[PDB]
Design a protein around this ligand. Structure first.
Ligand code: PR8
Ligand code: PRO
Lengths: 476, 478
């Protein structure tokens, strides 16, 4: 059972919820967490979805080794096998760019060779984490990373936006998490690329923005450095236009924070490992096949409508124990079946998100459960989307910044997009924060969806002519 | 390009050519690690889908455990990669990279299991693993490799053993039904079995061109040994505490290598239809603007018609390559069926289809295309299998005395011989056989076949002369 309340003490809530939900398990090496099936199934579902969509695009999967040689630094060295030292120390690769892009320079010779489109599902190691937290700040995480090379900038840009739409769909259609499409500022884009696009999400309980996924128009700078050249149709050598795009198990974290409540998790039915848990009202020793037999008939029929079902027939636990257990785990539907239910030909179903109860005839069960699951998924999304809209304040001047930040809100303000002004704003907001102790605010994205910018509008900080509406807040 | 090394002459060079020219492997600066390019990865994805669905049917759930292991947990040796520094700082405690995940998972198993109601526990992992050996071979013997490792705990040994055998049967289907590679089920000897466990079962495969057996996959009865090491106990109904019974089982990208070596020919890969991501490649023949737009249309129509039958079809309508280039390209790549449509063919109501395995061509009506391609694909799959099974049968010699060993070994053959199963006898046989190999050459136990020939009374061990316990399959090996 979850004791900490989600809005009073969020961090404690988060920890309690993900452990009592049987999502992760601890490990004797810091910053590392075992992903148990109740979370890994969610990864499996968003992975299958995204993989199907990028395969429609012509992206194909690959595997690159996890090691890199000396010809490459703050990196992890493997120096022995058994007790023997290696001839040359090898490193666990920092990035994938370093291994893939020489390979790309080999494989690309002519315009016939483009576009080249590769994706990799793997795990990533990061060595410097501050305070570890499952799915958010961890030593190892899972992701997918894709890397494309195209003959022209416009094709590459088109692909960047197509992938970004797939990330919108990952978060919104699968995990029911609303996100905002935008372009990163110069001070927050990938170091070597032309443009970074992003989907952003909001955590109301701490008012923090978090980056859901990135899609970079890398341009030619990497092709210049790595000598990825192709000869065009008229015989000249040209640099390829690259993109790269990535999404991680952080998405699981964003889903938890989005839909959980004081009772624990709420997993959207599209990714829940069990959509419907069947709980026999049995106490202690009451073993007759009457209840468990009807429970099995019901599981069979629900499964043939492609519903993911579990019967929790564990003898040594009370029905109320089981209710709380599966509520903390976040199953969207619970099917109570007891002697009175059996003696009426119905079942009682409870929704996890609202707690509403329904008495349903056994014949009606499969259609009504499909309907209720669609309703739960849409409800989760719509309420999160109203919360997101409610968390963004449209300001005009800098005096409105610190009020909004203290309402745990984001701000949308006209900005001149000058890079030094962003660092000044972060400095200023963090110092204002510090003195309020009696922290910093940064750009999240420049949204694709731009309100009108009246002629002559001034930037909310510098005073200079504002160019675009930018979204700011405190951030993960 | 095209393969020019011949398979029955220089096998090493043939293999390298086949896997490079088909765009399956790219070579890499670090010995023993290789880049797996999409064309290989498609096959790996087919077999992973197969196996994942089947183990899901058994109630096994996927999970992800960390890739690093602590020194203590690992040592509760010579092949384990150690991270010892970050930058130039030595780490306070060195940590290992995963060579296998028993010591990563079983502390968690010990925490998660309390009553007989927690059992069976059935978890599986798709991931990569590092073991630092010998001389490397792409797919076959690599230092980092992709695999699945499954781990289960049960209340009884008989239930564990049942699962061991079911998973081994799944590996037989992986190789034989999916990759059209025959394999022999058996037990490892006591000296060849998984360290710490009770009984290791295995499927074994054979490479005729060098006479070498190879371990395709393994299914372990870990028994209760690890349960003691990690304190994995449960309360039964009587209330008594009992150690669980554990299985461990895994299989890797080595299967791809075996498939290649089994089915390839002097032209390159031959991919069995069941794991071919492209089963039929449609080549539109365009020359002198003859009916260029019309034929492309009929190609798209045929694609649609065939997809309605779940045939995996690709149209190579790339304008920047000639048709002859396209033929060579899709044959090195091993696509089982090639469908040529030119204006001659649009005139008739037919298409020309060539099988990759034999080269035989067929003129097929459009209305007949779906059923006849389904039939040819099932035929190609079966012929790949049957030809390789014949070669496996003729690669094994049944002997009775040690004098027959070195002749058989030099005919590039395996030996099935009556053995007493004494552990020292296996190391003795290894050393004797390598010494005589000279006059990497050693013969070891591949497996004790499940399918045992009859053992006449008084049959002597082929090496010690003591009574023979069972028939054993010996060979030179990978
Ligand atoms: N260097 C290599 N390259 C490619 N494939 C390889 C290599 N070495 C072995 N294999 C392949 O991987 C498997 C490793 O199994 P196992 O005996 O080490 O057992 C276990 O570890 C148990 C079961 C899983 C969890 N624990 C072998 O069957 C072989 O096909
Ligand atoms: O770190 C990132 O954001 C990029 C995404 C693709 C691979 N690396």
């Amino acid at each position: 059972m979850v004791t900490a309340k989600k809005d009073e003490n969020f961090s404690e809530w988060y920890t309690q919820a993900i452990v009592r939900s049987e999502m992760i398990e601890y490990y004797d090496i810091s910053g590392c967490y075992i992903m148990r099936p109740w979370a890994f199934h969610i990864w499996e579902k968003v992975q299958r979805f995204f993989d199907d969509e990028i395969k429609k695009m012509g992206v194909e999967n690959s595997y690159f080794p996890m090691f890199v040689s000396r010809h490459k630094p703050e990196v992890a060295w493997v120096t022995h096998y058994g007790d023997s030292p290696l001839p040359e120390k090898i490193a666990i690769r920092p990035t994938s760019e370093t291994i893939m892009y020489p390979a790309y320079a080999k494989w690309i010779r002519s315009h016939r060779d483009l576009p080249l489109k590769l994706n990799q599902w793997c795990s990533v190691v990061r060595w410097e984490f501050k305070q570890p937290t499952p799915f958010l700040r961890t030593r190892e995480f899972l992701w997918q990373e894709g890397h494309t090379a195209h003959a022209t900038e416009e094709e590459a840009w088109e692909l960047v936006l197509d992938i970004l739409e797939l990330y919108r769909r990952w978060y919104e259609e699968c995990l029911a998490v609303p996100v905002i499409k935008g372009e990163k500022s110069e001070g927050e884009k990938f170091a070597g690329g032309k443009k970074t696009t992003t989907v952003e999400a909001f955590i109301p309980e701490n008012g923090r923005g978090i980056q859901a996924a990135t899609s970079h128009l890398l341009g030619t700078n990497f092709a210049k450095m790595f000598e990825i050249e192709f000869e065009d149709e008229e015989g000249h050598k040209r640099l390829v236009h690259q993109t790269s795009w990535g999404c991680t198990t952080r998405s699981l974290g964003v889903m938890i924070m989005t839909h959980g409540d004081d009772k624990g998790l709420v997993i959207p039915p599209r990714v829940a490992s069990v959509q419907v848990v069947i709980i026999p009202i049995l106490f202690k020793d009451e073993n007759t096949g009457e209840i468990l037999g009807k429970c099995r008939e019901l599981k069979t029929m629900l499964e043939k409508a492609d519903i993911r079902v579990r019967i929790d027939d564990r003898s040594n636990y009370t029905p109320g124990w089981k209710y709380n257990h599966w509520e903390v785990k976040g199953v969207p539907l619970r099917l109570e079946l007891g002697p009175k239910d059996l003696a009426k030909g119905t079942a009682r179903v409870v929704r996890r998100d609202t707690g509403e109860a329904y008495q349903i005839s056994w014949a009606d069960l499969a259609p009504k459960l499909l309907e209720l699951m669609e309703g739960i998924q849409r409800s989760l999304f719509e309420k999160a989307k109203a919360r997101l809209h409610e968390g963004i304040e449209k300001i005009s001047t800098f005096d409105e910044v610190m009020p909004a930040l203290n309402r745990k809100h984001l701000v949308l303000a006209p900005w001149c997009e000058d890079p030094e002004s962003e660092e000044q704003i972060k400095k200023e907001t963090q110092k204002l924060s510090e003195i309020q102790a009696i922290g910093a605010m940064k750009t999240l994205c420049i949204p694709f969806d731009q309100p009108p910018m009246p002629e002559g509008t001034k930037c909310f900080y510098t005073g200079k002519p504002a160019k675009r509406w930018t979204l700011w807040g405190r951030s993960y």
